[model samples]
Target: GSKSESPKEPEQLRKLFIGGLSFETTDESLRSHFEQWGTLTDCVVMRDPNTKRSRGFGFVTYATVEEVDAAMNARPHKVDGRVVEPKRAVSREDSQRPGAHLTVKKIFVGGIKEDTEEHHLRDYFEQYGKIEVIEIMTDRGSGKKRGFAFVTFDDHDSVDKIVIQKYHTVNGHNCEVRKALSKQEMASASSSQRGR
Candidate 1:
């Protein structure tokens, strides 16, 4: 009798968590934007149950993992004139596990100059590792720089290298670097700290 263990299926590989969406973006809008990459099996812009308004994020499920890869390769997706973030979906059980939030490959860069450009950030951070994405946030109403940016490296090691240094001088501004945390992570982290 042959004995072998079956390989675990990649459950969430074909699903993506779409973040930083505009408040006005709707389910149909999110679908239209991502449909260009591949066939979408399901898509939704999460909304507040009470207000029925967008929660500034959503989810998209592609027909196959290949489609998900293709969609991710096409970075910097913009919907409603705002740059939206697309990341592979994480299972609820995995996300809730201790230390799961600390494994992010992205770093938050704060205290950047208002006039700082993408190239400026790239020039400075590239020394640490290869950057996959750099997003300099802007105000929705004023259309002005938000004085911060999110930089995602291809590897989590780059984030650790930057965070260990703590402070970086980029484009004449003393910037701060730390692991990027999701809203829930941030809240849980703070609460846990307070409990102690």
Candidate 2:
């Protein structure tokens, strides 16, 4: 006879973050896909609030971090035999960017340094609008500069204006001003999916 009526399911057993999901992915699809890795507690797909359309991204919390890491590394970035380019996703607590009501239109950057900090990254994009956030990646081992960063402007207008006129180049590497996750969100999101 069982001691208790119900045994607690190991809710925190597996946790994973998956990305590069197709716009067609739904809760059902995400569940089916991750089942291959482990028992899925839940599958969340990111989408637009207005039309409720998928933003082509989603999250999968596995039973444990190990399972999550496995999925992160072996995560099928793509569905239907395609390569997945999954970025990171994290909870709002660990993140400082206020994306819930942001009105960013476009994003652009200039005067990027090899050891640029978050402020420098945000300052450049803030010119276009209200900069949501910026991410400056540094060398984890040596605490040096990675010479690249991502910035999320307040609105798409800034991105349109900045990226429309021209692109910024740094160290002959052509500074890449991209969209999504405001740098910080990118880090949090990416880090969440990662094992560390």
Candidate 3:
């Protein structure tokens, strides 16, 4: 805790975004494949709703940071019929903050009821495609849910489902799903709201 010293950002092992999947890949198959690397908290392979066909991408969430590093270092991964490239999954908030690089694999979910759980969100969004992580923030002091969550998909395309469906209701709450925007976008939106 010196003035000249900086605190190292804590390593987080949450999710990995991967590309180049086979059209035949399924949630079961993807889970089984990545399970070799370590205990997986969650796994998903993006697929089309109309045809129920794989979209050639997916994501896997590991139990620890070590597992993610090990998977990347364990040589190239071949799933479906092609080799896959993996990258650290970035949250919507991280990419949207001012001065940060823009990226997406994350969706903003609002209107989450206090009683809603992770599995509930998972089951609802699962229909869209593979999900790498489902995060619902809570108050650290009061331990109360924040009424919102960030759901990350394995493939960036999965976000299309939110737009296509244009609707989601869980726990009797009419939820809202949308691509997270940058801080600048949010600020502009806020100003527009006030202008009205």
- Using Cα atoms with residue i matched to residue i, what is each candidate's TM-score against the true structure? 0.49, 0.39, 0.42
Candidate order, lDDT descending: 1, 3, 2
**Tens digits of lDDT, candidate 3, 1-196:** 1134322422223466667778887878777777787777788888898999988877887776566666756646787667876655544544344422223556778766655688887888777568988878775766776567778777554553353333578667788776765356556553445556
**Tens digits of per-residue lDDT for model 2 on 42-121?**
77778788988767666666555445445655634566343544323332332233442233343434435547666554
Which sequence of candidate numbers ranks them by TM-score, best first?
1, 3, 2
Model 1: per-residue Cα lDDT over 111-152, one tens digit each: 766557888888888887789888888867667765678887
Q: Where is the poorest 10-residue window by lDDT in model 3?
A: 1-10
The models' CA-based lDDT, in order, is 0.73, 0.51, 0.65
lDDT, model 2, position 75: 36
- Predicted structure 3: lDDT: 0.65
For candidate 3, what is the TM-score?
0.42
Model 1 scores worst on lDDT over the 10 consecutive residues at: 1-10
Distance (Å) between predicted and true CA of 63, model 2?
Answer: 1.4
